[PDB]
Design a binder for this molecule. Structure first.
Ligand SMILES: Cc1nsc(N2CCO[C@@H](C)[C@H]2C)n1
Ligand SMILES: Cc1nsc(N2CCO[C@@H](C)[C@H]2C)n1
Ligand SMILES: [Cl-]
Ligand SMILES: [Mg+2]
Ligand SMILES: [Mg+2]
Ligand SMILES: [Mg+2]
Ligand SMILES: [Mg+2]
Lengths: 194, 194
């Protein structure tokens, strides 16, 4: 029923643009929308990846490896799955393993890779693949993992037990001003509700 | 140790603006970020998203989702019922109201998250994730009456909680739809649990 009629640039930055979207509503009437897009998306199947990294080690409870970074759009520190944009010509799997190593030091193994999923579809066209990766924490490669942050990346690694994820996030949010990411919170909620 | 120095308006629509954020990196170097914000926040958060657990006896529990044309995406998305919180509305009340407008179901609050971020590398947008149960055997939910506001066009899709991820993959495979990242994250953790 509905479709895009036109997309008019309002303002293009170096990384993000705002567009005026004209579309057809399902009563055959024309409406507009204000749309955000990134300027960085080429032929990638999505803008980015987020990595669900399951750290597995003998005689440990499985942990979910999270990162804490300052996020200038938020004006504050945020707790998130490891994530980054997919480089031109890079596969979502390659992006995920690379980002995970850059941000956490860990060398993972791919488990699964989602289709492109929308970040905030009432606002932007931004998409990611959500990639599940297991980390063999008994491998010597992963013994004392050192992050390799790129320029202007400053990331702290926080591993929390899967079996208590939501409570452990609640405890961190209680102890300081930080925001938990909605996908991390959603995943912790489902772990509770299962 | 990181913080915002200043924000420069780049461009301001009715619903969204783009800003150039200056911030101090943790070495003491000054850096810029292109940040998106909504103009509508006044509020605990911009929005709510509702995780609606439809409970009917002798049936699988379902998670109730919505499918809607999203102009930023140029296509149809599957998402948790959701909307912006009205000035003076609580996150709980926004949840029950949006759930009702979009699905016609009347539900009870189970739990309510703190403000969580939607896309913190790009925007300051936040929501409250509100878990709501719906007593599907109650007369008020027998023939659920969706009350959409102006310009909303919402299809209701209820999926069993126990096979959520496989059911969503099927919809994507059959229907050229984009699943929301929070929905997909919750679906993932249902499978990953235990
Ligand atoms: C980002 C953006 N562009 S238009 C918009 N809306 C505000 C909420 O109500 C919708 C019917 C529509 C007018 N939000
Ligand atoms: C939206 C937006 N504004 S600046 C940005 N960048 C994303 C890549 O990492 C940083 C080095 C930074 C320059 N993304
Ligand atoms: Cl529940
Ligand atoms: Mg990153
Ligand atoms: Mg990175
Ligand atoms: Mg809505
Ligand atoms: Mg609504």
């Amino acid at each position: 029923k509905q479709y895009i009629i036109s997309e008019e640039l309002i303002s293009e930055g170096k990384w993000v643009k705002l567009e005026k979207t004209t579309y057809m509503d399902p009563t055959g009437k024309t409406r507009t929308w204000e749309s955000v897009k990134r300027t960085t998306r080429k032929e990638q199947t999505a803008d980015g990846v987020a990595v669900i990294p399951v750290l597995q080690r003998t005689l440990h409870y499985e942990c979910i490896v999270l990162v804490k970074q300052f996020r200038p759009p938020m004006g504050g520190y945020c707790i998130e799955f490891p994530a980054g944009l997919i480089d031109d010509g890079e596969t979502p799997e390659a992006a995920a393993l690379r980002e995970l190593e850059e941000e956490t030091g860990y060398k993972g193994d791919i488990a699964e890779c989602s289709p492109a999923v929308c970040m905030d579809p009432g606002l932007s066209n931004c998409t990611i693949h959500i990639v599940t990766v297991t980390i063999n924490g008994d491998d010597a490669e992963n013994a004392r993992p050192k992050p390799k942050p790129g320029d202007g990346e400053f990331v702290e690694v926080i591993s929390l037990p899967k079996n208590d994820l939501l409570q452990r996030l609640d405890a961190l949010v209680a102890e300081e001003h930080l925001t938990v990411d909605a996908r991390v919170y959603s995943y912790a909620l489902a772990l509770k509700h299962a």
